[PDB]
Amino acid sequence: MFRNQYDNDVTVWSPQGRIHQIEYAMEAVKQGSATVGLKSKTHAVLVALKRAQSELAAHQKKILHVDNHIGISIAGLTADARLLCNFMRQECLDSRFVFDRPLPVSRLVSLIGSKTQIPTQRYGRRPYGVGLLIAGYDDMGPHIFQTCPSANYFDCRAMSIGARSQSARTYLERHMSEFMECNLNELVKHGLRALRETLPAEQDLTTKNVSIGIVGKDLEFTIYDDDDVSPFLEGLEER
Amino acid sequence: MSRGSSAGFDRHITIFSPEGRLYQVEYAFKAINQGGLTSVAVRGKDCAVIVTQKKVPDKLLDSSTVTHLFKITENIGCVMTGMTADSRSQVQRARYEAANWKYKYGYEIPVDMLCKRIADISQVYTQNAEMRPLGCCMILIGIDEEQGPQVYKCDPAGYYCGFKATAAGVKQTESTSFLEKKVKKKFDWTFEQTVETAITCLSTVLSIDFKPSEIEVGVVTVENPKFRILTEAEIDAHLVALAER
Amino acid sequence: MFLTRSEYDRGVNTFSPEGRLFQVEYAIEAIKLGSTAIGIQTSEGVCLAVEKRITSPLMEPSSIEKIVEIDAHIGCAMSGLIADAKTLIDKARVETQNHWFTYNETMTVESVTQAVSNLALQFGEEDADPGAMSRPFGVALLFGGVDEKGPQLFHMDPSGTFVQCDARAIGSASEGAQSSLQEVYHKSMTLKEAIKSSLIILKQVMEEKLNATNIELATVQPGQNFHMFTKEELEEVIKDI
Amino acid sequence: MAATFFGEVVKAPCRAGTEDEEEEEEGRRETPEDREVRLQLARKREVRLLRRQTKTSLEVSLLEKYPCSKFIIAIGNNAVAFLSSFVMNSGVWEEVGCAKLWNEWCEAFCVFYHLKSNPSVFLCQCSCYVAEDQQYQWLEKVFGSCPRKNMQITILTCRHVTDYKTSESTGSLPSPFLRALKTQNFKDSACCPLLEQPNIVHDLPAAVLSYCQVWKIPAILYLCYTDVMKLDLITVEAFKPILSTRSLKGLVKNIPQSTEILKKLMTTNEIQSNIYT
Amino acid sequence: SYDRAITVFSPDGHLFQVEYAQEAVKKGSTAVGVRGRDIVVLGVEKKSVAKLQDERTVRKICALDDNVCMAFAGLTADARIVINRARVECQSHRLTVEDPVTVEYITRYIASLKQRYTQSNGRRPFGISALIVGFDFDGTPRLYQTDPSGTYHAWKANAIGRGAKSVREFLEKNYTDEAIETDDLTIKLVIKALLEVVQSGGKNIELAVMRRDQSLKILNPEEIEKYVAEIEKEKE
Amino acid sequence: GTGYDLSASTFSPDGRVFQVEYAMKAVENSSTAIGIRCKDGVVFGVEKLVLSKLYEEGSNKRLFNVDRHVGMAVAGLLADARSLADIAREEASNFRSNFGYNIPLKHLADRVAMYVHAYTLYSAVRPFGCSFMLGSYSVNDGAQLYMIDPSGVSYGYWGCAIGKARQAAKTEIEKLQMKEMTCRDIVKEVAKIIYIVHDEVKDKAFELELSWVGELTNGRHEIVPKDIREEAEKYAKESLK
């Protein structure tokens, strides 16, 4: 009630010391659909749930390709995800041009942090309403990063973001002690079981609603979609 | 915050009230008292002295970093009263403007010209809707060439004026009355008498017997034109010499 | 306690306490004031049918066309604000010609849709690249074309965001027409039956009756170019009932 | 309003609605150009109960022409879906009118059904969004001015979890959860915790609960505070505890087929727009 | 959720400021444009003429080039701005491609200017609608209309301004192929449409015709009164 | 100060800019960081809160390296703290590029504090809701510890605490005779103080984040090595009971 003067702009501090448009942008992230990221000692996989209005539409393109070693999964506003993906792709190109080597994932994520922090201080802007799960591979191994509308980024052992992603995070917290020595097949299965935990008890993972993206020691970032996910889904025990 | 002007007669800087008053400038003048410190500057026959309170309400705080006396040029020093960050930013601006003056005109800036430049900038702040006044007061001292000691006081409205003695802060009115009474009697205070006058004004309107660590004193002299900040031993010597009398 | 007024929708760039931007959903409501456009993607081609809604008999129908041509293999169906629609249409046209100049080949349907989306998602943020738009475009488009990957249909809404589809209805009766396309559509149907279903649904959701003057049909087939049905072709297709 | 140009004088929002001046400087010389506009706008936004095959002029309140002993209102997508899947899957329900209303946010209006086996039972099915200046008209067109106190109204609705006022974060709460709010004559205890003290409910559900409180009718309001306010399966399943309550006691016959009806009705799935993911 | 900002949608999806600019159009004097076979005619009512006025200075029919013409309804100062921009654009197009503007080209340019002003709520739309008649370079007569939003259409006959609805009903009922056969019948049809909203006709009527390969010709009050007299004779 | 508190360019009727005060309360929103200056260095320690067991250890660090010789411990909004870390790094690198030697810590504190102040001045940007401490060591300068707050006021400290429990931690620091202690005993005492002011029920499951710059690192900012941090945590735990 005493909140109405201080939550309409990202340039107003509430007398409790809170910016409220930042928190509302975080809600905008929660309005997507669940996507999961997890990594082993050699691979970093991204698993996403697609919505297509349940019929007559090709599903959302939820996993995007940024470079040969970086790929992102989005939850939140699509326009913001595309703006940030264009930024990431341009930065990776610039690194390859100037320095001839793949841009480190942590450096890319730091650049995203600055870029998305500027709208949360300036007038006439709004925070980015998209949260990302960045999967990378560089000299330092696999990486999973989570970026937020607040311009925070986190180094994750595993992470789920999106709508009803708390269930996936509960699964990942329960099972993260065995992710590292998993091979690619059962790592993708772990991600698939977490993503399934974000679903009603009746619905089940199919090829039509699952998108997978692997990067790893030998692999470049590849996205598996709509029929390429069948090898990964065939072996997934029932719930 | 984003943009626009707040509606109200006392809520934006570019709004007059029915009586033609800019109330945000007066609220900046009240911001000068935010800090609870008083400054006294006294002009003598051949010296100018700035004296300010030094409150350090923290055992953990390094007391050599708490200071309100600043060096603008080699020969101009100021005591800043008001909001601390605003004071330090206006000192930074005065330093830049003085360096530019020396660059353009080939000789070092006078005191009146420095306070005039700072007050011109302050006026620009009061007229535009994007900026706000600084909640601080600048009292500048220097020895000119052929006028003598100079004490000048810029203020948040863009007003500046030279004085024979001036005060800023909480006890500005009490100190101004004290110094008026002192200056009516005699004014050619040598150098010691100006320091005693400034310290006595501060210690009377505050009714506080000072310690060398509760007070800051910066001086210029005709024979030593460079701005100098007295050490605690020198202030203690002045205080014991004032107490014995 | 008390019920109080909270408003989060009177400006772009403001999230509601729900993570939701209302000035973009009001632009989608702006779409729902347009005329109904149905696009069906089949393996024999893609058809685009729109409801024309001629306001006066004195008005040249050729000037209110809701189906335009971006290139010989792509056509758009429009619904919403016309002035915005034509800006996006011209962006698509110029982009296809830029692509031909630079790379000596036809731009694919998805690439045209992506270029138009790059233009359409650049609202808000007005004091950054003046000449930008400052609000969502109030138009939804239906790019239906034929390229290296066969017939394709895309949909863009007042978000600058596109998704590939197989049967879309946009416009004022998109809910009823979409519910109808839900059953009448099957993934392997001929183009003649796609046109048939489009016109049947358009008859269902129009307040007037099907004559060859108040609707507009276009098709893009793998061999043939983009084609806008004429008065006599439309007459024959509707007299097929 | 929010600063169209540099230095434009802007007035702050007023949460009490007094920036409208309550139509101050009333101008007793309102031009007929103005009065025609005002009356036309008032006519555009009118509520109107109309009977099937009659199509207009129901002329009397809906609960005072038919007798009633039980009245279940579901408001919103999820409450309507739940009520349909788990209650109309049983014996025949007969429609006895809709409430046509025009709005900026309105979306099937309440169709009112009364059970053929038990004519005293009723259901309102609003996906209809009733605006503030339509809720009291809706109340008078449905209940009327003769509030017989033999009814047992049961309102069902959904709210976003971010509307919950809690000292924790509204992202740590286990959504969806049910909260109740019952009137004074509702003797039985609720199957869910009662809604807290700083929390209020303000809409047509609040209109019906306020009516039942004033006129001493038993009424229970069931609030699902969900994190997904579109048609969602978990949100609809959140209402299931209500089925073991005397109001919805004899109306729930086959739960196993209701899950299949619910899965089908989810596959219908009014199309989402591309703002997200 | 309201008006008062140019770039704000209402929850129904309406941009009301543009619609209020079109309200500004609907108060202006009625302008009637009829497209004939080899003549294109424009007629505006002279609403509330003052006797002590130089009527040459308050004319609402203007020439944009030697083949394109234009009448407007709405705020006259906005119309002056838009007209002069259109004139510069006609000459600039001739400089670019050597060919005379097609009537659609200049209609499109005028609409793009109005549409530029319907963006950016720090600007104000043009409160005018225009009736751009003309002949293409291959001789086809055209009649277009733009409105404050940046939206233009091609017409056979049209009316804008106050009483555009009555005049447009009259035109629909009376615009045939037998009303267009001669130049005189087109002129008389425009005058008859304008006589449906004009009281004390003839002296409140501003006709200007443009025949193919000829410049705009404003009809003086004598010719207009002769046409009105012919109309009353044909009334019998 | 309602009515005068929506902009950082509005003065309250008593000369108070309230957006800046709300930004300082924003600093009070976060968990505590303490910094103690000793006879031969500076030691930082942050009551870092474990958001999830899913985060790779070391993420969300609040102890930055601003230069080879300077370390930064932050509180408040972490995005703001990272932006200010970037600014401080830029200032130190620019000074070294221009003038060829390591930037003095007092000068670095002035540059960054004057940036923070510049944000407390306009309606176009909001004040930083983050406070931080800088700490260095040079043989020709001694240990130095500075704290900047959202208003742009930087002072030099012997012991500082910023965050939620700054007052309790400040009470606990005052008992230390830090002017005559080495970095090792200060590390143990910093761990103790972090453990004392931690609120074990409201907040949950924190992890120490210790860092020093001193002569034991030869004027180089570092993370306290794992074994010394283990010893400090064990001392801190055993002292708590």
Add this chain to the structure above:
Amino acid sequence: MFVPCGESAPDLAGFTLLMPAVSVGNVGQLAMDLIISTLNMSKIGYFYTDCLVPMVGNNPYATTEGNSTELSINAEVYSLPSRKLVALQLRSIFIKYKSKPFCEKLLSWVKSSGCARVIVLSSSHSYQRNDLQLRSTPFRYLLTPSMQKSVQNKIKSLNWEEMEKSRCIPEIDDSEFCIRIPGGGITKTLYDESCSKEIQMAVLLKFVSEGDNIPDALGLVEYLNEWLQILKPLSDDPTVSASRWKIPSSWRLLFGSGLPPALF
């Protein structure tokens, strides 16, 4: 209209009606919460009308678990027959074109029920304060001509400042003067209709802005307590102030909800 809670009117024979106005800052409503909570007044009825946006929630004055479950609607009437005081509490906002109908219905109830006085607790926009009003006290009062039952002299002895009469329509140098409470909501309508109907109404108000308006509510109840003595007179205690108006339990989470994680 007024609907009792027990099929019987409570006989407000000569009571003083305390009512809010939905005004800027909700200061009148918050002051009414303070009064109803401190005096421990008991609900006696409802004011059911078409005029306020409907809302509902459990007892906003919960003190024990027994009465914390008592449903409340947007307009409810409370009473304290020991002190001959009746209080209305409007907890919602008015529907467009419905403020005046509410005012005539309420004042008809006041005349019929037999209430002696009416006291409206309100507020006004403080950004519209002119040169003088900035340097005066925030609190103003209005008395209708009938309200003279020895209370004009009491108010005079209290050294209060009357609401300043602006000119009815500006731009006219004659400047016919009539009251104008900008941001008082129904305050002016209530005043004008009371003057027409010959009701003893008083209006007490504060110039407030919006934000945390709890200090303003406490100030307004202290103004009213300078007049009425609904409480022991102010600085007479060993500074047991701050403990003399009972803050209702519903005055919780007034800035919303808790702080999200991973920020800060």
Add this chain to the structure above:
Amino acid sequence: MAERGYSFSLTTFSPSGKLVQIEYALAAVAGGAPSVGIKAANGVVLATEKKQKSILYDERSVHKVEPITKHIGLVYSGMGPDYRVLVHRARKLAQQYYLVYQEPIPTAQLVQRVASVMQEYTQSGGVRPFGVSLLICGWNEGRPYLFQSDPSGAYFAWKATAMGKNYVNGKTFLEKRYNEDLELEDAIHTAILTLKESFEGQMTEDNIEVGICNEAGFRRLTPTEVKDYLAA
């Protein structure tokens, strides 16, 4: 006093056509220290009241009566900083005129250019009018000039005027005592008397300021000269 926000915007006319934010800037002038200008037959007089009225002011520091060139001089009543910013601008404009035309700027030309600057500040929005009304005295072509430029940027040529506090009574006083054939000395006497009308106590040479403009050019009277004039 907020007429529907017609009171707080500089770029909004009120329904009656008034701009009630430029007349609030004229209330800053009418709340400034009194000023007097008297155009005698052979010179102009500019007398003002000093705000720096206490003993603690250096009086070689800041002045209210300023020269623009050798032949033009200003006084103001209103807000002092605005005066200073306009004075430096007026001096620049005069020197640009000299640099172009090799002749001293005429009084009317200077008044016009200064008034155009003030007008600019009364039309944009996001900016604030000037809180000063100037009196410009000059001597051109063997003919004195007295002008007044107000915050709106509208200047007036006067024979005698009064600004600042109590200026309506001052103008009434001046009407009864001004005659065209007045000599510069009697003009100085009358200007000092008009200041003495609306003055807060005893008037010393150290709390008023006088500047004259005759054939020899504009000059600010020294405190001794003002003392001598006050003694008579």
